[PDB]
Design a protein around this ligand. Structure first.
Ligand SMILES: CCCCCCCCO[C@@H]1O[C@H](CO)[C@@H](O)[C@H](O)[C@H]1O
Ligand SMILES: CCCCCCCCO[C@@H]1O[C@H](CO)[C@@H](O)[C@H](O)[C@H]1O
Ligand SMILES: [Ca+2]
Lengths: 703, 706
């Protein structure tokens, strides 16, 4: 049933600690590895920075000849002597606050103009930022792989060495994201052209989808500027599809080159998206990897969790991210490639007592492995730090291997995990709620994001009112997912693309947060789901367009739905709940023939209905609510109770979060107190306990 | 000579609680007032919502004829009976999560399009957002004042009623700010044109300042779209000056109207700017009030503090905001018109254990009065709730007048304040550091802000590299002010406009965070300050332009500075601290003439110097640093130590914040732990050491008799 790492043919919780040899006094390398092993960690993780080892063009030092901390060979030997497995990450990009993001200075000085990412004007976006598929950049990357990969091959677990996993590059696309800007390098734009021709075959086919008027593919230009026309939305949508193929090509080139050295260990990649201690944009970033994950079943994606604190303000972020990774990668364990330990930022404090709770909550929220980032603080050698002298603060160990407060928290959590991993790794939550992941709503990193300065997407200019990023951030991430977690209802997330009908039928309810557009495949899937006996909850709109904003009303017509879009007060009543605040004046007003009306505008117009269709049930709400009032929790609760779904526990205090994890033999009840209040409460199945502020309690039951 | 409220010629700590009569069962009004009084609160505060009392056009109910909770008269009477003074806030805007922000539905339905705030295209920004000087808006506001003001007048203190203060409207500009669009209503356009003609007199004079070629004033439009030329920047700068005069006109019109009813009580206004539990944009909004605060000494501005949590993430916001209000309103006490009690929104928790610490920190940080907002929860009658039925959560009292957890925290704090107010209100901190408040850097709400939809200001397009909003947020608010508070160095903030040299010479150091532009008046003042014996710290730029980005090299010349702007690594060395990360590749490179070089680029070029000029000392750093690394705190500490400035206490844990307040008689030591760690530390006055244990997110106060 569950996916989990294995060691000695038993379920193994992967406990890795990040220790940057290149930022640590080599006299203290053994001491760091021993103190890490002494927490019950089984693995150590590090970058192998290209800049640090190719000290000049075609001058490699992996042996400490030119600086003791260039002795990668001895660090590998120390990992073996101290019985730690090793995760190695040779880039080419490492980021990691290393100057040039890990690329050599000699390389960046020597590359042509056309090797760099370019803005719509052909100007260099950043003196650190190459275009991934630059021939020059791949030439030098390959010459770097030519020296480091034989070292990694020799020490891989497949040759009985310590290296169990290797990360390819680092957070692909994170620069396109953090910078406003997309890459318009002429090589990238040529690949975009091949992609479009391959996709549409003829300009007449493209023209009928885009409503364009090209005489050939030679008239086709990469999209840029604000979207003003539906044709510009279409161009930008395919520009999004192209970049997912682009990142897949980049990672495929790295992988093929790696495999050519006989390296047969587990390959990895790491997902960015946390900022300011929430992860509402991480679903957009994980959507950029959609083609990699379809095409590479052997690359395990891990999450880069950066909570910064642990409270009701960010409690839902790590669960929603873990669940979305499970949706996109069901055949591999959910794990954190980077799992916050200390802080990257001196002024952004990371409290041991905060992180200890985050670690336990991560177990409740289904994590199967992590790498404490950073277990060990580093000191940047020879001004090679992007920022100051010091790399991370409030870690488990300082750069000189002094134990800090987090050390004892990590030892405590690891001791719990080692005691329980055999049973805990084989547990799941009983989810009767499925929440649909509709990937095209997330495909906006070029036109609409929290990090993009000027918005290229204003849906009002396209005759639309439901913005897909507002939907996926406020209605889905901070709304429905946050609400179900707060109400202690288990949900699973399912990717709707090429989705098996049989994999929706296990759930008593499927929840779809829908904009006005949705592809024919998904409209067909949801139609079949209800017709065959599924209970669907759909809001805030029955879709009437496809991803190209061409008419598509399959779901509408299959369900016998008619509506007019009409302006009204933001407040509606729904299931007898008065003053439900909704995001939009514009609401769908439903013909109620063969329907039960269950929501009403201030002027008593029908803005929600329930209906039987074939063997199934439909609940449509023509209005958008997130979680910004107690009425919103009341409405989510009412909806869940339409199909008689129960919480696993009665807990006397509604502000206590719990997760029940079980198999046939074992149950774990995780109680999580995300609040600055000592809480005393009791519980019983669908008895009294005190939890400190920002704290936890774990309870075992034999079934 | 602290500024504090006075009662019976004694120091009086203003303790108010907010209780919305219109959202509470009137059978429970008395119980809310009694329970508030029993916390030691002296005052109660409420809106009087226009929408609630003008139930239809020209149909008024202040007596509970149509709804018991419309009996404003009886609520006023109960405040008197329960020995509470009363703050009334009749709008016209109240916001307060009330439908249409307090404006009548019938009004918003009746008003013509020209009553509304309009974008650049002439479209309504929001259906509830009126243009402040709309003829139609002020006509209906006046008719609302015609009915509510005679009642307020009759129930003033001077007529033996309970009413001691009235707020004019609510957070002027907050609605425009949150909408992300500025008002281009034609009243605004026409008033701006009059402002520009009055300012420049002739199109030739405006052309010479802006470098434009207009044939007449008729060719000039209110600026719209992005700034691409220095002439666009000039136009926007005058538009900012115009908006400060526009808000002054609004509040003058309301004030003159109020005075005509024989209302002589203290008038208030309330400062917005906290969002997501920080206040780094509050300085921009308070700056929109600069002309109000110069023309109306009888209007007391108070802060609206919404911290939402109390941790290192936001510890610096309340002190910086208290200090900035003091800088702009030096003759009135610092007080909080709205002082967070519970939470306005269910999904953002307000813990008693956080807010109790915020209250104590506020005393440490010099607050002299506050109004707990919300003391009492409300339930919206008749669908009047903008966002839902319940108004506020986790308050002192639920809507039914049950005590909640916060009630005990407020009772504890108030008990300390009543015991200590006589000394505590007269206490000062010993600030040897003054930080300059240069208001023109904050004049960007039309072109650059956290909330503005459109980024109109890109200084690189003007041949500049120091963005004034980046400066005032990262280098000043989240940088220097945060770093000083974290290092436990007391600082004052002084408004540099029309600033007395006499009121800077008190300090050991004056710190100026400077962009490439600064007006002649300020450049001269800082010149005189150093020549006459002041110690100036100036970074990241010697300015060379005025506020219109024309040549002004007064300070550069007076200080005998030569510099070239050159690109280098972000990292510099300063005062022997290596790998100080700085914000810009571009830095000021100084030559070594009659100076001690104390900072060096990665190529060892001089990007900071110290020199003696007349009787004073100058330290210039040609690079930008806030507080984003440990080196930044080391650098701030090094700079403070240049003039032998010392902390009040040796404390063994550098992460403990403290404030020492004293007068002749009394010393209060405030310890604040903004961290999620139980801390055990020792301390001593810098003159055996005492041991203290402090819980997470907690406080200790020690009183000493001198
Ligand atoms: C545009 C300049 C890029 C330099 C910074 C790149 C790396 C910063 O670090 C990145 O920060 C993101 C935001 O918090 C996180 O989501 C990522 O996990 C993290 O690696
Ligand atoms: C665009 C619609 C705006 C309607 C008015 C909403 C007023 C919300 O309330 C305001 O929020 C601000 C941001 O936290 C605070 O700074 C203010 O103090 C507070 O009054
Ligand atoms: Ca029908």
């Amino acid at each position: 049933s569950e996916k989990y790492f294995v060691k000695n043919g038993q379920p193994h919780f992967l406990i890795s600690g990040e220790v940057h040899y290149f930022r640590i006094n080599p006299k203290l390398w053994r001491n760091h590895l021993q103190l890490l092993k002494q927490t019950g960690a089984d693995t150590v993780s590090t970058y192998i920075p290209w800049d640090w080892h190719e000290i000049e063009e075609d001058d490699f030092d992996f042996e400490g000849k030119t600086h003791p901390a260039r002795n990668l060979i001895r660090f590998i030997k120390l990992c073996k002597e101290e019985n730690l497995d090793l995760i190695v990450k040779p880039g080419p990009y490492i980021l990691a606050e290393y100057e040039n993001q890990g690329l050599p200075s000699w390389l960046l000085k020597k590359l042509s103009k056309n090797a760099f990412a370019l803005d719509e004007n052909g100007n260099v976006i950043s003196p650190d930022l190459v275009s991934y598929l630059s021939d020059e950049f791949l030439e030098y990357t390959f010459k770097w792989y030519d020296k480091v990969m034989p070292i990694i091959s020799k020490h891989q677990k497949e040759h009985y060495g310590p290296i169990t996993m290797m990360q390819l590059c680092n957070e692909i696309g994170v620069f396109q994201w953090l910078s406003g800007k997309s890459d318009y390098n002429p090589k990238v734009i040529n690949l975009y052209k091949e992609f479009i021709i391959q996709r549409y075959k003829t300009i007449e086919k493209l023209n009928s989808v885009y409503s364009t008027n090209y005489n050939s593919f030679d008239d086709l230009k990469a999209p840029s500027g604000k979207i003003k026309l539906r044709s510009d939305y279409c161009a930008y949508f395919d520009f999004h599809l192209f970049f997912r193929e682009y990142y897949n090509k980049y990672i495929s080139i790295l992988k093929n080159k790696i495999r050519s050295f006989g390296i047969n260990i587990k390959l990895t990649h790491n997902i960015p998206g946390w900022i300011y201690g929430n992860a509402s944009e991480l679903p957009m970033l994980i959507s950029t990897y959609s083609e990699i994950m379809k095409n590479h079943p052997d690359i395990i994606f891990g999450l880069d969790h950066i909570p910064e604190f642990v409270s009701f303000r960010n409690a839902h972020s790590d669960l929603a991210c873990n669940k979305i990774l499970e949706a996109m990668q069901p055949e591999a364990p959910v794990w954190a490639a980077e799992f916050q330990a200390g802080t990257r930022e001196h002024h952004v404090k990371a409290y041991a007592k905060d992180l200890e709770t985050f670690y336990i909550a991560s177990l409740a929220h289904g994590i199967k492995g992590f790498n404490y980032y950073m277990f060990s603080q580093g000191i940047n050698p020879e001004g090679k730090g992007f920022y100051g002298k010091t790399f991370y603060f409030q870690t488990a160990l300082d750069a000189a291997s002094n134990k800090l407060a987090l050390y004892d928290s990590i030892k405590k959590v690891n001791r719990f995990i080692r005691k329980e991993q055999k049973d805990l790794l084989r547990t799941n939550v009983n989810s009767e709620i499925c929440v649909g992941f509709y990937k095209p709503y997330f495909f906006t990193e070029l036109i609409s994001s929290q990090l993009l300065k000027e918005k290229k997407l204003n849906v009002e200019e396209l005759g639309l009112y439901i913005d897909p990023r507002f939907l996926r951030e406020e209605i889905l991430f901070n709304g429905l997912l946050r609400g179900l977690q707060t109400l202690n209802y288990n949900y699973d997330v399912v990717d709707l693309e090429n989705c098996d009908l049989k994999s929706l039928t296990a759930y008593k309810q499927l929840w779809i947060t829908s904009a006005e557009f949705m592809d024919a495949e998904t409209q067909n899937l949801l139609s079949e789901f209800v017709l065959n006996g599924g209970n669907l909850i759909l809001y805030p709109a029955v879709p009437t367009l496809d991803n190209y904003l061409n008419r598509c009303e399959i779901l509408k017509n299959n369900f016998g739905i008619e509506f007019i879009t009409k302006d009204s007060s933001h407040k509606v009543s729904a299931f007898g709940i008065e003053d439900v605040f909704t995001a939009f004046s514009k609401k769908q007003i439903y013909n109620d023939t063969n329907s039960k009306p269950i929501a009403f505008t201030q002027e008593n117009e029908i803005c929600g209905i329930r209906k039987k269709i074939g063997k199934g049930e439909l609940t449509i709400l023509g209005f958008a609510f997130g979680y910004t009032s107690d009425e919103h929790l009341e409405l989510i609760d009412k909806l869940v109770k339409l199909n008689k779904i129960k919480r696993e526990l009665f807990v006397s205090d509604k502000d206590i979060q719990f997760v029940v994890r079980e198999n046939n033999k074992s149950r774990y009840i995780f109680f999580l107190n995300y609040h600055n209040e000592r809480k005393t409460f009791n519980y019983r199945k669908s008895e009294e306990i005190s939890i400190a502020p920002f704290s936890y309690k774990v309870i075992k039951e034999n079934k």
